Design a protein around this ligand. Structure first.
Ligand code: HEM
Ligand code: HEM
Ligand code: HEM
Ligand code: HEM
Ligand code: HEM
Ligand code: HEM
Ligand code: HEM
Ligand code: HEM
Lengths: 110, 110
């Protein structure tokens, strides 16, 4: 019943009439499997479900860019090293050479 | 879509014509929420799903008691401190006073 999707295409195309600045992002669970599911899916105890980070009421704000609900801040902030995409990748580099990408065109596929 | 059940009643009544020796076990995720989901649900990478520990092909052997698929060994072995029920509870005690139960009548409800 509960199936985990290996490859997920995260896209801003879901926002009404937003003209995206970057391409879609492909997230693979395989490369992140050693990380506790709840570290990223940090709201599991609040809803007892695992849902999209961009669900209504979560990180779905495409208007503001510096708010907690903002898409840009959420996935690129370097002040959070546990669940921010670039935040953790950035943090790994402080521990030694890391392949985890910071380049915009590594996450954002074209 | 993906909802996590808080209270799960684990029962051996699901085994053909097995006469159970002990009562059903109630497992609550709330008391175990700090533990990585995949530590217990250790076969997630093999099936990419989270299913019952007693699923066919897993720990469903009620005939043998000392085999890996055996129900008795799986949940009570003290040689595994990561996913065995009594194994971890036992291990916690070596770290200091722990309320985590070892008494048969704590897990097995009556
Ligand atoms: C741990 C093995 C783990 C589980 C379990 C898990 C499940 C999961 C599901 C069911 C989805 C789909 C949600 C939906 O219906 O939209 C999902 C999606 C994503 N996950 Fe995950 N996930 C686990 C682990 C991890 C880890 C360790 C991270 C962080 C590196 C993570 C992140 C993500 C992301 C991102 C998605 C896409 C979410 C979106 O907004 O579309 N998962 N996960
Ligand atoms: C999806 C797996 C997901 C990610 C990724 C994610 C990241 C994230 C970050 C980086 C923060 C920190 C922001 C900061 O600058 O400090 C953060 C904070 C909150 N999130 Fe989140 N988040 C993901 C999923 C979800 C979901 C599904 C919701 C909505 C229920 C949501 C909500 C929030 C809230 C609220 C916060 C602030 C409070 C807190 O727990 O720190 N997030 N998220
Ligand atoms: C945020 C949802 C997020 C994204 C998106 C993301 C992407 C990503 C890519 C594209 C790679 C390269 C490999 C691949 O294509 O899968 C990659 C690899 C690693 N990541 Fe990541 N990642 C996201 C989030 C996080 C978080 C929150 C962490 C850390 C807690 C993290 C870690 C890693 C690691 C480790 C790798 C492997 C790098 C390597 O040495 O090969 N990612 N991520
Ligand atoms: C490189 C500095 C970089 C830029 C620039 C960038 C931009 C960007 C924007 C503007 C968005 C919002 C949606 C849009 O396309 O307009 C966005 C969203 C996501 N990003 Fe990004 N991004 C940059 C870098 C990275 C890196 C290195 C990763 C992966 C670690 C990454 C991930 C994400 C994710 C996840 C999202 C949300 C889903 C989406 O809208 O595509 N970005 N990024
Ligand atoms: C981490 C927050 C986490 C998730 C996610 C999770 C999910 C989950 C589901 C969906 C079930 C139902 C499976 C089914 O359909 O039968 C389930 C059931 C049990 N879980 Fe769990 N679980 C998470 C965390 C943990 C942890 C940390 C443990 C170990 C202490 C654990 C164990 C169990 C057990 C036992 C069950 C009942 C399984 C059965 O055989 O009936 N879960 N979990
Ligand atoms: C359900 C969350 C679940 C539990 C609990 C569990 C425990 C468990 C233990 C204690 C062991 C160690 C046995 C020993 O004495 O060394 C163990 C080993 C295996 N398991 Fe398991 N297991 C749970 C779930 C599942 C599921 C859903 C399956 C079937 C796909 C399964 C299978 C196995 C197998 C095979 C092993 C041996 C190989 C290994 O990974 O160590 N388990 N399990
Ligand atoms: C194996 C599937 C398993 C069961 C069953 C189980 C039950 C259980 C009970 C009945 C309690 C008491 C509280 C309650 O009713 O929920 C309890 C509490 C703790 N457990 Fe446990 N537990 C199972 C598995 C595991 C595993 C694998 C670990 C360790 C990795 C673990 C840990 C804990 C902890 C910690 C507690 C809290 C004790 C406290 O100080 O209150 N359990 N468990
Ligand atoms: C105390 C030493 C103790 C006994 C005895 C005991 C017995 C027992 C049996 C015989 C089974 C198999 C099914 C049956 O009832 O015949 C079984 C299964 C489970 N047990 Fe147990 N058990 C004892 C202790 C404990 C403790 C302290 C816990 C919780 C940490 C626990 C847990 C479980 C679980 C889970 C199962 C599987 C589901 C089920 O069949 O009930 N047991 N136990």
């Amino acid at each position: 019943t509960f199936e985990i999707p290996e490859s997920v295409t995260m896209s801003p195309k879901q926002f009404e009439g937003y003209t995206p600045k970057k391409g879609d992002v492909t997230f693979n669970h395989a490369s992140h499997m050693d990380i506790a599911c709840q570290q990223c899916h940090h709201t599991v105890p609040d809803t007892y479900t695992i849902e999209s980070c961009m669900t209504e009421g979560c990180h779905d704000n495409i208007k503001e860019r510096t708010e907690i609900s903002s898409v840009e801040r959420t996935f690129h902030t370097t002040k959070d090293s546990e669940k921010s995409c670039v935040g953790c990748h950035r943090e790994l580099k402080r521990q030694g050479p890391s392949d985890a990408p910071l380049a915009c065109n590594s996450c954002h596929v074209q």
